[PDB]
């Protein structure tokens, strides 16, 4: 079982994305079936967690803590299922077998993430016969305002523009690159309050390390074969930024962070020592501070990944100087 896919041996999300070099040739379908399906997911195939990482009863009880997680995972379930639909087009247009296999593995991961998030909703007492409606009601505004515009950018680049590597650049820099750090924050936030959700996030973060580093290899390699494509890639990044500047993401993050605030306040006994990041107790953080930290992580990670990709000028386009 490769070190990078092992449940105990795999790096954290930022750490892996900023330090590892993985290529689509390495992470082919055999590697995924062995190292992921039979590795990372050993004992966690159905729900993403084991009996030792349970969903607490307090996550089934009506209140702000439960609402914060309902809102969060309704939204992520939709994000991941729509990402699966988008990535399908990356598979269909994969320029070769290496990319076909790799992007098949990413597609299944995203479908898996959607599945374990939705299952977690059932484990929190959302009735099975109200599950579809409930996710759809809760996530509708976020889907329409945030997910659809950024995902349509990727789809438009790969499909309408016929630009595969460009499409990968949208997905790794503008989509995953932007959202993965908030996923690691979510794992830190939830780990004591909802161990099942912490383990679910952890397994997703291991997958995400692979998506981020393989996507970077695709862009990096293309760019040094075709150095002329550099301006085109930078324009992709610029348009990406312009699209985020018009999306009201903050509004949706702060809404779940204020629910979470009331939630964690009502469960301070489970949180005592707990630091959300080095030297910072979760209990003494605010919604704005957790949003800001997730942004700081996003900026740091992008600085590191853009250099590795050969697009250090995008650090400027994304206003990271
Ligand atoms: Fe995912
Ligand atoms: Fe991903």
Report CA(231)–ligand 2 centroid distance (Å). Answer: 26
- Return the closest-CA partner of residue 267 out of 43, 47, 66: 66
- What is the CA(260)–ligand 1 centre distance, in A? 22
Do 181 and 301 form a contact (C-beta atoms < 8 A)? Answer: yes
49 labeled binding residue: no
Is residue 143 within 8 A of residue 246, CB to CB? The reply is no
Number of helical (H) and strand (E) elements in the chain, helices listed first: 13, 2
CA of 274 to the centre of ligand 1 (A): 26
Burial of 152: CB neighbours in 10 Å, binned 0-12, 13-18, 19+: middle
Its domain, for residue 137, covers 1-321
For the chain, the domain total comes to 1
d(CA 269, CA 282): 12
Query: Cβ-count burial of 259 within 10 angstroms (0-12 exposed, 13-18 middle, 19+ buried)?
Result: buried
For tokens 């809102």, name the residue: 71
15 is in an annotated binding site: no
Torsion of CA 190, 248, 155, 36, to 10 degrees: -10
Which resolution in angstroms does this entry have?
2.0
176 a known binding residue? yes
- C-alpha span between 68 and 258 (Å, rounded): 8
242 labelled binding-site residue: no
CA angle 84, 86, 89 (to 5 degrees): 110
């Amino acid at each position: 079982i490769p070190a990078e896919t092992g449940w105990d041996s795999a790096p954290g999300l930022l750490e892996g994305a900023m330090t590892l070099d993985l290529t689509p040739e390495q992470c082919d379908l055999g590697y995924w079936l062995r190292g992921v399906a039979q590795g990372t997911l050993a004992g966690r195939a159905e729900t993403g967690h084991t009996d030792a990482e349970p969903t607490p009863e307090h996550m089934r009880a009506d209140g702000p803590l439960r609402d914060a997680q309902v809102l969060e995972l309704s939204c992520r379930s939709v994000a991941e299922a729509q990402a699966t639909r988008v990535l399908a087009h990356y598979v269909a247009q994969a320029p070769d077998i290496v990319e076909l296999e790799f992007f098949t593995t990413q597609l299944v991961d995203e479908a898996r993430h959607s599945m374990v998030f939705r299952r977690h909703l059932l484990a929190m007492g959302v009735p099975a016969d109200r599950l579809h409606a409930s996710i759809a009601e809760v996530s509708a505004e976020y889907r329409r305002e945030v997910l659809e515009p950024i995902l349509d950018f990727a789809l438009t680049t790969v499909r309408d523009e016929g630009d595969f590597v460009g499409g990968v650049a949208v997905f790794t820099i503008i989509i995953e690159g932007v959202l993965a750090p908030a996923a690691e924050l979510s794992e830190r936030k939830w780990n004591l309050l909802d161990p099942a959700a912490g383990a679910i996030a952890r397994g997703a973060a291991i997958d995400e390390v692979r998506h981020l580093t393989v996507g970077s290899s695709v862009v990096r390699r293309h760019l040094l074969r075709r150095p002329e494509r550099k301006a085109a890639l930078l324009d992709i990044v610029r348009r990406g930024r312009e699209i985020w500047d018009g999306i009201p993401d903050r509004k949706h993050v702060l809404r779940r962070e204020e629910l979470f605030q009331a939630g964690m306040r009502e469960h301070a006994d489970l949180l005592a020592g707990y630091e959300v990041w080095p030297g910072q107790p979760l209990l003494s953080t605010t919604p704005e501070q957790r949003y800001a930290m997730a942004e700081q992580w996003t900026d740091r990670m992008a600085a590191a990944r853009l250099v590795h990709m050969g697009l250090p000028e995008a650090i400027d386009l994304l206003r990271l100087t």
